[PDB]
Amino acid sequence: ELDQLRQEAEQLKNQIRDARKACADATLSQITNNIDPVGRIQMRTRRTLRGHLAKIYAMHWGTDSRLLVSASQDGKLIIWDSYTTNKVHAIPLRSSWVMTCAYAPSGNYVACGGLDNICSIYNLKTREGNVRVSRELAGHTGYLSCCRFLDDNQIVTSSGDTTCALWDIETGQQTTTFTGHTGDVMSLSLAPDTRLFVSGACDASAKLWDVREGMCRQTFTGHESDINAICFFPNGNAFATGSDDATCRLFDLRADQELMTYSHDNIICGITSVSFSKSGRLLLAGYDDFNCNVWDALKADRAGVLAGHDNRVSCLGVTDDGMAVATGSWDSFLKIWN
Amino acid sequence: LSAEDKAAVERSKMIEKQLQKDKQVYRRTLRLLLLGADNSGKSTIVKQMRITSGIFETKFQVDKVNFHMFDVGAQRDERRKWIQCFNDVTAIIFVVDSSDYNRLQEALNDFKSIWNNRWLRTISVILFLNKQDLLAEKVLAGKSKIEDYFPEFARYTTPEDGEDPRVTRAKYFIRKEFVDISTASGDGRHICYPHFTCSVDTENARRIFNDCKDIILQMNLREYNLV
């Protein structure tokens, strides 16, 4: 009875597509024509961070816009100060194949993981002063792509084995597990309400999961290639995801459909990282063309170009207050643009 | 600047000195990548180098030079994502089971995909034709040959430039096919290194060292030419 289930799933998918298309009253471009354009937003590098021994892969800002955490592919977690340009801490990692880093909102723990399939969380407020391995948890059969903190007790981790779970720092066990996507998860993005979170995999689809209920609520399959970037809107109602086809798509959770498609003919490199500002008008996207591009959330026009890198822009992150943006590339340079 | 904001400068300088020392230690040692299908006998190659973790690291010493080989420990068939993390390495060794002809096409396709990588276009790929004795026995038994799997073998001759001539012609045809697949869109910035080996030979370390030396020499020449 496999054919019956297949045709039933196909009919359900067609019905969902028809119901989504019936709600498409108008496009976002036709509504945002009367608003004034953002204009050429020029940005300059105020601080230049140097000291990385390998390619910069991941970075993360804390609750304050002063401290920053960064990971390097040689097994080093660096704590940068955006104001004094001095290094605060240096955590040596046991496995140099790190692909992501996380910063707890309390400012006491920092997570890391990658190809070692082991998530290591280290405490920064150790009474002994030196960095000690706080929680080295394992259990996943795939490479870790992204890790985030919801509070001082739980941590969400993504793995390449198409299975995610919420780990508890107190016991080091999977509290809530999910069914998983149909492809390897690439990155994560937590909503401000700490209740839902959208996860993107290589199957050109993004699924909205719940923290308490281990199930998916919404699914978006509008992309055409592997989704390599994902970031939620500051209001928690929409999220933009970039693919390898040099296309970014903005999916709204309340609308459950695509709103805006950022793309360009002369742009052929895929999107690596996406981050939103405090207001959400400016969307910064890093491409493999050694440049970063700023787009308007409503006008879908280019607002500025960033050519202060000599390699692929690996990651970019905007502070909580929108004062500056930290961009790290494979050239071991972590530049802080205004 | 306060007193405290000076102490921070001294701590930053100490951290920078520690990072410089760690960079020196990391640069004194060389790093290599190991790739291969499940049918290939890479485990024997790792075991003979006596001179839930998805990554296996093997450290050894050849000619007073430290080599750290990194191999996939436990992962799925996905290869398009984690291949970008193993770039900028000294060399990549691709193990292929030249005995079985079924997996030979898959190995050739994997080698063509890895060589034509957009990010790994500056890293050379070393090829080790493992299991030569098994291939020789299979081609001398007369049960299965390359004719049933590749038609071009019917129009290939031994080049002019104690082993049976059939095995020699077969391995030369395999090497020629590998060279023709590798040189396709190579741009001359990186070249391949094929070598015949088995699971009992001990001179593999010398060949790996010579290949790494040639790669470093080519890198120095490219640096001097400002390409």
Partner: single-chain antibody
Amino acid sequence: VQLVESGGGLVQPGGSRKLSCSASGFAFSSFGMHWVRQAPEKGLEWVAYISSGSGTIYYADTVKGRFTISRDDPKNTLFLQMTSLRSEDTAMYYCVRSIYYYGSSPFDFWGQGTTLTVSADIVMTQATSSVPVTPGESVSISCRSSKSLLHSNGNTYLYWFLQRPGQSPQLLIYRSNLASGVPDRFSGSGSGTAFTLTISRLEAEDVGVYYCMQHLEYPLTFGAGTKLEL
């Protein structure tokens, strides 16, 4: 962590003495070391300070040329050589650790210290020295400074130390910013010139002497200290 000091005792005037300090339970090479002297029936006073790797060493203007501080990082030890001791040098010395970064807590742990018996900058001045207080009421100690400690970066360099009879001084506030290991009853407020340390609930373990310290420059100067009897 533990800080065991040794070398004190009776010393004839004009001699020398090498005070030793063994540290355990933490990274000795990561924390900067400070020497704090205390005279009998008097307040505290800074002596010398050394940083990691002996890259920055400072001494008090009164003891320049006489004392010499050194550290053994492979052995995790501190040494202080004193030559030409005077009749006033009879005091109890304490070794304190301090790390400096954003969100740190310098002068968090005070050692046991050892006794030694022989034979223009910023100065903290307190208006009161002893305030009788009964259980049930609140405590509000005021302090006035001669120079505004409000630096351009916006950080207030004010440290509070509660020394109990027989025990080592415990850090309460390092910057308003409450320190670790202390209850939330203690609080600090005020402007860059005047400061106020308030206590929400006064318990039986909060008795002792409160000392204030500034950290705007290297030469430190402790206050008179307010003693509470109960």
